[PDB]
Coordinates of all heavy atoms in Angstrom, one line a residue:
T58 N 0.9 -1.1 0.0 CA -0.1 0.0 0.0 C 0.9 1.2 0.0 O 1.7 1.4 0.9 CB -1.1 0.1 1.2 OG1 -0.4 -0.3 2.4 CG2 -2.3 -0.9 1.0
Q59 N 0.6 2.1 -1.1 CA 1.5 3.4 -1.2 C 0.7 4.6 -1.1 O -0.2 5.0 -2.2 CB 2.3 3.4 -2.7 CG 3.4 2.4 -2.9 CD 4.5 2.6 -1.9 OE1 4.4 2.1 -0.8 NE2 5.6 3.3 -2.3
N60 N 0.5 5.0 0.1 CA -0.4 6.4 0.5 C 0.5 7.3 1.3 O 1.3 6.8 2.1 CB -1.7 5.9 1.3 CG -2.8 5.2 0.5 OD1 -3.2 5.6 -0.6 ND2 -3.3 4.1 1.2
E61 N 0.4 8.7 0.9 CA 1.1 9.7 1.6 C 2.7 9.5 1.8 O 3.2 10.2 2.8 CB 0.4 10.2 3.1 CG 0.4 9.3 4.3 CD -0.6 8.1 4.4 OE1 -1.8 8.2 3.8 OE2 -0.3 6.8 4.7
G62 N 3.4 8.9 0.9 CA 4.9 8.6 1.0 C 5.1 7.3 1.9 O 6.3 6.9 1.9
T63 N 4.1 7.0 2.8 CA 4.3 5.8 3.7 C 4.2 4.4 2.9 O 3.5 4.3 1.9 CB 3.0 5.8 4.8 OG1 2.9 7.1 5.3 CG2 3.2 4.7 5.9
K64 N 5.3 3.6 3.3 CA 5.4 2.3 2.6 C 5.0 1.2 3.7 O 5.6 0.8 4.8 CB 7.0 2.0 2.4 CG 7.3 0.7 1.6 CD 6.7 0.7 0.1 CE 7.3 -0.4 -0.7 NZ 8.5 -0.1 -1.2
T65 N 3.8 0.6 3.4 CA 3.2 -0.5 4.2 C 3.2 -1.8 3.3 O 2.7 -1.9 2.2 CB 1.7 0.0 4.7 OG1 1.9 1.2 5.5 CG2 1.0 -1.2 5.5
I66 N 3.8 -2.7 4.0 CA 3.7 -4.2 3.5 C 3.1 -5.0 4.5 O 3.3 -5.1 5.7 CB 5.1 -4.8 3.0 CG1 5.9 -3.8 2.0 CG2 5.0 -6.2 2.4 CD1 7.4 -4.1 2.0
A67 N 2.0 -5.7 4.1 CA 1.0 -6.6 4.8 C 1.0 -7.9 4.1 O 1.1 -8.0 2.9 CB -0.3 -5.9 5.1
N68 N 0.6 -9.0 4.8 CA 0.4 -10.2 4.3 C -1.1 -10.3 3.8 O -2.0 -9.8 4.4 CB 0.5 -11.3 5.4 CG 1.9 -11.6 5.9 OD1 2.8 -11.9 5.2 ND2 2.1 -11.5 7.2
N69 N -1.2 -10.8 2.5 CA -2.5 -11.1 1.9 C -2.6 -12.6 1.9 O -2.2 -13.3 1.1 CB -2.6 -10.4 0.5 CG -4.0 -10.2 0.0 OD1 -4.9 -11.2 0.3 ND2 -4.2 -9.2 -0.7
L70 N -3.2 -13.1 3.1 CA -3.4 -14.6 3.4 C -4.2 -15.3 2.4 O -4.0 -16.6 2.3 CB -3.9 -14.6 4.9 CG -3.1 -13.9 6.0 CD1 -3.9 -14.0 7.3 CD2 -1.7 -14.5 6.2
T71 N -5.1 -14.6 1.7 CA -6.0 -15.3 0.8 C -5.7 -15.2 -0.6 O -6.4 -15.7 -1.5 CB -7.4 -14.7 1.0 OG1 -7.5 -13.3 0.9 CG2 -8.0 -15.1 2.4
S72 N -4.7 -14.6 -0.9 CA -4.1 -14.5 -2.4 C -3.2 -15.6 -2.9 O -2.7 -16.3 -2.0 CB -3.3 -13.2 -2.5 OG -4.3 -12.1 -2.6
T73 N -3.3 -15.9 -4.2 CA -2.7 -17.1 -4.8 C -1.6 -16.6 -5.8 O -1.5 -15.6 -6.3 CB -3.6 -18.1 -5.6 OG1 -4.3 -17.4 -6.6 CG2 -4.6 -18.8 -4.8
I74 N -0.7 -17.7 -5.9 CA 0.3 -17.7 -7.0 C -0.2 -18.9 -8.0 O -0.8 -19.7 -7.5 CB 1.8 -17.8 -6.6 CG1 2.0 -19.2 -5.8 CG2 2.2 -16.6 -5.7 CD1 3.6 -19.7 -5.8
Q75 N 0.2 -18.8 -9.2 CA 0.0 -20.0 -10.1 C 1.4 -20.5 -10.6 O 2.2 -19.8 -10.8 CB -0.7 -19.3 -11.4 CG -2.3 -19.3 -11.1 CD -3.0 -18.3 -12.1 OE1 -3.1 -17.2 -11.7 NE2 -3.1 -18.8 -13.3
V76 N 1.4 -21.9 -10.7 CA 2.5 -22.5 -11.2 C 2.2 -23.7 -12.1 O 1.3 -24.4 -11.8 CB 3.5 -23.1 -9.8 CG1 4.8 -23.7 -10.3 CG2 3.7 -22.1 -8.8
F77 N 2.9 -23.9 -13.1 CA 2.9 -25.0 -14.0 C 4.2 -25.3 -14.6 O 5.1 -24.4 -14.7 CB 1.7 -25.1 -15.0 CG 2.2 -24.1 -16.3 CD1 2.4 -24.6 -17.4 CD2 1.9 -22.7 -16.1 CE1 2.7 -23.8 -18.5 CE2 2.1 -21.8 -17.2 CZ 2.4 -22.3 -18.5
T78 N 4.2 -26.5 -15.0 CA 5.4 -27.0 -15.7 C 5.0 -27.2 -17.3 O 3.9 -27.7 -17.5 CB 6.0 -28.4 -15.2 OG1 5.0 -29.4 -15.1 CG2 6.7 -28.1 -13.9
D79 N 5.8 -26.9 -18.1 CA 5.6 -27.0 -19.6 C 6.2 -28.5 -19.9 O 7.1 -28.6 -20.9 CB 6.1 -25.9 -20.4 CG 5.8 -26.0 -21.9 OD1 4.8 -26.7 -22.4 OD2 6.7 -25.5 -22.8
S80 N 5.6 -29.5 -19.4 CA 6.0 -30.9 -19.5 C 5.9 -31.6 -20.8 O 6.6 -32.5 -21.3 CB 5.3 -31.7 -18.4 OG 5.8 -31.4 -17.1
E81 N 5.0 -30.8 -21.6 CA 4.8 -31.4 -23.1 C 5.5 -30.5 -24.2 O 5.4 -30.7 -25.3 CB 3.1 -31.6 -23.3 CG 2.4 -32.5 -22.4 CD 2.8 -34.1 -22.5 OE1 3.7 -34.5 -21.8 OE2 2.2 -34.7 -23.4
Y82 N 6.3 -29.5 -23.7 CA 7.4 -28.6 -24.4 C 6.5 -27.7 -25.6 O 6.9 -27.6 -26.6 CB 8.5 -29.3 -25.1 CG 9.1 -30.2 -24.0 CD1 8.9 -31.6 -23.8 CD2 10.2 -29.6 -23.1 CE1 9.6 -32.3 -22.9 CE2 10.8 -30.3 -22.1 CZ 10.4 -31.7 -22.0 OH 11.1 -32.5 -21.0
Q83 N 5.3 -27.3 -25.2 CA 4.4 -26.7 -26.0 C 4.7 -25.1 -26.1 O 4.1 -24.4 -26.9 CB 3.0 -26.9 -25.5 CG 2.4 -28.4 -25.7 CD 1.1 -28.8 -25.0 OE1 0.3 -29.5 -25.5 NE2 1.0 -28.6 -23.6
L84 N 5.6 -24.6 -25.2 CA 6.0 -23.3 -25.2 C 7.4 -23.1 -25.6 O 8.2 -24.0 -25.6 CB 5.9 -22.6 -23.8 CG 4.5 -22.4 -23.2 CD1 4.7 -22.3 -21.7 CD2 3.7 -21.4 -24.0
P85 N 7.8 -21.8 -26.3 CA 9.2 -21.6 -26.7 C 10.1 -21.8 -25.5 O 9.8 -21.3 -24.3 CB 9.2 -20.1 -27.0 CG 7.8 -19.9 -27.7 CD 6.9 -20.7 -26.7
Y86 N 11.4 -22.7 -25.6 CA 12.2 -23.0 -24.4 C 13.3 -22.0 -24.6 O 14.1 -22.0 -25.4 CB 12.6 -24.4 -24.8 CG 13.2 -25.1 -23.6 CD1 12.5 -25.8 -22.6 CD2 14.5 -25.1 -23.4 CE1 13.0 -26.2 -21.5 CE2 15.1 -25.7 -22.3 CZ 14.4 -26.3 -21.4 OH 15.1 -26.9 -20.3
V87 N 13.4 -21.3 -23.5 CA 14.4 -20.2 -23.1 C 15.5 -20.4 -22.3 O 16.4 -19.6 -22.3 CB 13.7 -18.7 -22.8 CG1 12.7 -18.3 -23.9 CG2 13.1 -18.7 -21.4
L88 N 15.3 -21.6 -21.6 CA 16.5 -22.2 -20.8 C 17.5 -22.8 -21.8 O 17.0 -23.0 -22.9 CB 16.0 -23.4 -19.9 CG 14.9 -22.9 -18.8 CD1 14.3 -24.3 -18.2 CD2 15.4 -22.0 -17.7
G89 N 18.6 -22.7 -21.6 CA 19.6 -23.2 -22.7 C 20.1 -21.8 -23.6 O 20.8 -22.1 -24.4
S90 N 19.7 -20.6 -23.3 CA 20.2 -19.4 -23.9 C 21.1 -18.5 -22.9 O 21.3 -17.3 -23.1 CB 19.1 -18.7 -24.5 OG 18.4 -19.4 -25.5
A91 N 21.6 -19.2 -21.9 CA 22.6 -18.6 -21.0 C 22.2 -17.2 -20.4 O 22.9 -16.2 -20.3 CB 24.1 -18.6 -21.6
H92 N 21.0 -17.2 -19.9 CA 20.4 -16.0 -19.3 C 20.6 -16.0 -17.9 O 20.7 -16.9 -17.2 CB 18.9 -16.1 -19.6 CG 18.6 -15.7 -21.0 ND1 18.9 -14.6 -21.6 CD2 17.8 -16.5 -21.8 CE1 18.4 -14.8 -22.9 NE2 17.7 -15.8 -23.1
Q93 N 20.7 -14.7 -17.4 CA 20.7 -14.3 -16.0 C 19.5 -14.8 -15.4 O 18.4 -15.0 -16.1 CB 20.9 -12.9 -16.0 CG 22.3 -12.3 -16.4 CD 22.3 -10.8 -16.4 OE1 21.3 -10.2 -16.0 NE2 23.3 -10.1 -17.2
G94 N 19.4 -14.8 -14.1 CA 18.1 -15.2 -13.3 C 18.1 -16.5 -12.6 O 17.1 -17.0 -12.1
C95 N 19.3 -17.2 -12.7 CA 19.5 -18.5 -12.1 C 19.4 -18.4 -10.5 O 19.6 -17.4 -9.9 CB 20.9 -19.0 -12.4 SG 22.3 -18.0 -11.8

């Protein structure tokens, strides 16, 4: 929350992240191009 210059970080206990694996190689494969982010 960014109000009046004040920096507030709180837990959002009910929010989700999404995760999957491209196990059938249906997406462009960018690993193998020596990128930063390891």
Side-chain angles (χ1 to χ4, degrees):
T58 47
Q59 294 299 83
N60 291 311
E61 73 277 322
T63 307
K64 186 62 171 286
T65 301
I66 307 161
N68 292 306
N69 197 326
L70 308 172
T71 59
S72 285
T73 55
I74 62 160
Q75 277 162 259
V76 185
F77 76 102
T78 53
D79 180 31
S80 292
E81 303 294 90
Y82 312 94
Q83 290 171 133
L84 293 167
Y86 193 90
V87 302
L88 302 164
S90 292
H92 287 301
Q93 293 171 14
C95 61

